[PDB]
């Protein structure tokens, strides 16, 4: 439906120095997920792994959680809840955990939680924060987008952002960053073209 609210998209690094990182994968036609620093935009395939890295200068307490949420980028669509198209809503798609209409899933984590906000109508997915490996600099979450940017009845060629928030056990904001996302068939190919846009 239509949300009444619009989520905040402002970058906020906060106490813990919270930032996002991405694999630098290139644009070889074979790559399924590649990020463009120029456009601050992730190019990913339908249902393929999209790794997103959490980087903190300071370790947040335990019980901290990581939420991901999609919104439309253009002003005239902001109040519209990003949601899978009817075809992929009805698809034999289920991973056993995720609601059939959420765009964003997390793979590899039985502690995942999915939320239909009963006041705003917004979809989000939440996982526990885990500190990096001893000897790693970052935490990695594997995200899946289950509906193409092309799908009419869904996003229908309108751009989206993903909003990653850091929250504490009670849900208070600890930090926030964001990136654009396009779910296509040719991520390597469509990034180099869009990076060719710009110049």
33 annotated among ligand-binding-site residues: no
147 annotated ligand-binding residue: yes
Number of chain positions touching Zn ion (CB under 5 A): 5
For residue 85, say whether it is annotated as part of any ligand binding site.
yes
Measured in whole angstroms, the distance separating CA 75 from the mean position of its chain's CA atoms is 19
Q: By CB under 5 A, name the one of 52, 104, 147, 163 that touches Zn ion.
A: 147
At its nearest, how many Å lie between Zn ion and the CB of residue 125?
17
CB-CB contact of 103 with 44 (8 Å): no
Q: Using the rule CB under 5 A, is 115 a contact of Zn ion? A: no
Question: Which of residues 65 and 83 has its CB atom nearest to Zn ion in the complex?
Answer: 83
Q: Where are the alpha helices (DSSP H) in 19-132?
A: 86-89
Per the annotation, does 138 bind a ligand? no
Residue in 85, 155, 174, 181 binding Zn ion, rule: CB under 5 A: 85
Alpha helices (H) along the chain: 86-89, 187-197
Does 70 interact with Zn ion (rule: CB under 5 A)?
A: no
How far apart, in whole angstroms, are the C-alpha atoms of residue 63 and residue 71?
26
Exactly one of 39, 78, 112, 151 binds Zn ion (CB under 5 A); that residue is 151
71 near Zn ion (CB under 5 A)? no
3-state class (DSSP) for residue 53: strand
Residue owning tokens 């997390």: 106
| Binders of Zn ion in range 27-66 (CB under 5 A) | none
| Separation of alpha carbons 1 and 34, rounded Å | 31
The distance of closest approach from Cβ of residue 63 to Zn ion in the complex, given in angstroms and rounded to an integer, is: 35
Q: Work out whether 105 is an interface residue with Zn ion (CB under 5 A).
A: no
Sign of CA pseudo-dihedral 177, 8, 73, 107: positive
How far CA 131 is from CA of 12, 128, 146, in Å, comes to: 19, 10, 27
Summarize the annotated binding site for Zn(2+) as residue ranges: 85, 88, 147, 151
Chain positions contacting Zn ion, by CB under 5 A = 85, 88, 147, 151, 154
């Amino acid at each position: 439906p239509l949300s009444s609210s619009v989520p905040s998209q402002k970058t906020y690094q906060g106490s813990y120095g919270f930032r996002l990182g991405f694999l630098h994968s290139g644009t070889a036609k074979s790559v399924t997920c590649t990020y463009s620093p120029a456009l601050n935009k992730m190019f990913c395939q339908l249902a393929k792994t999209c790794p997103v890295q959490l980087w903190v200068d300071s370790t947040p307490p335990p019980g901290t959680r990581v939420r991901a949420m999609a919104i439309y980028k253009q002003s005239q669509h902001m109040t519209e809840v990003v949601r899978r198209c009817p075809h992929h809503e009805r698809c034999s798609d289920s991973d056993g955990l995720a609601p059939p209409q959420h765009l964003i899933r997390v793979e590899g984590n039985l502690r995942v939680e999915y939320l239909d906000d009963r006041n705003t109508f917004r979809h989000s997915v939440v996982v526990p924060y885990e500190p990096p490996e001893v000897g790693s600099d970052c935490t990695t979450i594997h995200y899946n987008y289950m509906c193409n940017s092309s799908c009419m009845g869904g996003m229908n060629r309108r751009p989206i952002l993903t909003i990653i928030t850091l929250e504490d056990s009670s849900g208070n904001l600890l930090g926030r960053n964001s990136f654009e996302v396009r779910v296509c068939a040719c991520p390597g190919r469509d990034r180099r073209t869009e990076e060719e846009n710009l110049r």
